[PDB]
Design a binder for this molecule. Structure first.
Ligand code: ARG
Ligand code: ARG
Lengths: 305, 296
């Protein structure tokens, strides 16, 4: 009934250490602001305290020179997206809704995922080495398509052994986050501010977290409510005003890319509690965004897991 | 009749094009984020050969050394002529000080660099020469040194070829509060865009005043009704001066360009870059200009 789409993106996952970010100002600004200057169709940049995580298609990857500040995940990642029958886009912040149908099945079959929720939709990245299993695992409950050119197309055999799944500690900083979009034609108007925030910036427990993605021409931004005050008024867009979000940071040790079942151990319980959630993986840690009014509940759900 | 020594200590550098990317982070700051640096004198000129930078010491601190960055040896001071009570003189007035400033400094072996902007004409001199400068200019000018914002009271000369590309140039200013609105475009032009025409683009932010020199074709790329220009109609043609890099020691080059133009009563902006000199003259007069300058 429901459809699962394999998008036409081959994605690399990278981490830029803060002290070296300046070195990559020239390519990044290009990828951020000059769509006529590159062939990139998948760009995601997330600032955390640890680093800047990049998820970029191969075309954008060509723009980033190697250095001691740039760590590159070894695998190439494919991008999955759930939609409804006939191809209608499903509501955003729906990571918990696919907890039983996508996340848990993939975890059970030892498929490691990376999550990238955006304003528009929820992307699930899987290593190309696992594609067959993915299909095998999800063909029962989804009609699977491959996006060839611009239109859909109906659809090594050893899943590697990962480390033993464990329970990971969680933290909840006090920041109030917003999920916003933007008319691309207005991106220049915020450019300088965005640049200032990404490249030249930097007790209540708070975290530095700022996500900007440009994917198939769609812009998505996750930012602190205070950071939004820095931006020109009446440009940042959201269809549900007053909706602010609290973050649950998942991980004590860096999580790597081999352990499975982390997203599942967060989204399962939240799904059972009927709580909506965005979910964004960075190079080292996971991040869930839940409605602020429910944060307490969420914590209690996650501490008895 | 006043000569002001401004409170700027300036370094003159050249970034080779293949290395420009390395300096995107500092330059953007200096271009667009005034709250993030103490720099008060910033000039960036793109030429076919390089990007010439003139930056005060604070801005100089932001620029890491590399194989693409040439640095002129001396520290330069900034001179500016003004009227009876500090009132500013007309812009494009390099020729109007040909007799009173440029020629005397050349005669006393003081090497200069010129930086004309939309607002005024700056004359840079190596600090080691300051005394001579005073000794030369005290007779005709009341000399004031700017302190805390208040005015407190070589090689053998050589012939240089001249060339006039066909670009029509505009000298423009901008309200700083509108600088964000053009940022991306400006960035695209400076950092991501790279014959009887030349590649020449000047941007300066000096004491909060913005000045831009660009060809009309480049002006079409910018959002309309933001770039400001007082007198319009007749744009400017460039005369490029030099057949090989001119260095910083030879004197009398500016004098041999601005002197004759002064005698012909022709106005001119004048911009020195790391390697060559550039005069901007009214376009409809280019023929006359070339005739005046080749009387030699
Ligand atoms: N670097 C990371 N964020 N790793 C954790 C991502 C989620 C984990 N691979 C899972 O399948 O549940
Ligand atoms: N790099 C240069 N632009 N050099 C020439 C500057 C003018 C010359 N020093 C003069 O005093 O007349």
């Amino acid at each position: 009934m429901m459809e699962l789409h394999i998008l036409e993106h081959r994605v690399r996952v990278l981490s830029v250490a803060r002290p070296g970010l300046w070195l990559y100002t020239h390519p990044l600004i290009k990828l951020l602001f000059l769509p006529r200057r590159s062939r990139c169709k998948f760009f995601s940049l997330t600032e955390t305290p640890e680093d800047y995580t990049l998820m970029v298609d191969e075309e954008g990857f060509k723009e980033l020179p190697p250095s001691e500040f740039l760590q590159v995940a070894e695998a190439t990642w494919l991008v999955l997206n759930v939609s409804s029958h006939s191809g209608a886009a499903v509501q955003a912040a729906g990571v918990t809704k696919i907890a039983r149908s996508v996340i848990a099945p993939l975890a059970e079959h030892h498929v490691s995922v990376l999550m990238l929720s955006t304003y528009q939709t929820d992307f699930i990245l899987v290593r190309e080495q696992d594609l067959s299993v993915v299909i095998h695992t999800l063909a029962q409950e989804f009609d699977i398509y491959r996006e060839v050119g611009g239109e859909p197309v109906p659809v090594f055999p050893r899943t590697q052994h990962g480390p033993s799944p464990t329970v990971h500690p969680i933290q909840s900083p006090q920041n109030r986050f917003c999920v916003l979009t933007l008319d691309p034609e207005t991106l220049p108007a915020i450019a300088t501010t965005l640049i200032d925030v990404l490249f030249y910036s930097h007790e209540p427990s708070s975290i530095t977290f700022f996500a900007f993605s440009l994917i198939e021409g769609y812009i998505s931004i996750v930012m602190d409510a205070e950071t939004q005050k820095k931006f020109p008024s009446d440009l940042l867009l959201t269809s549900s005003s007053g909706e602010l979000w609290r973050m649950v940071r998942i991980g004590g040790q860096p999580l790597g890319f081999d352990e499975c079942g982390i997203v599942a151990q967060i989204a399962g319980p939240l799904a059972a509690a009927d709580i909506s959630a965005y979910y964004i993986s960075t190079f080292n840690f996971d991040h869930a965004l839940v409605p602020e009014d429910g944060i307490g509940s969420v914590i209690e759900v996650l501490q008895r897991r």
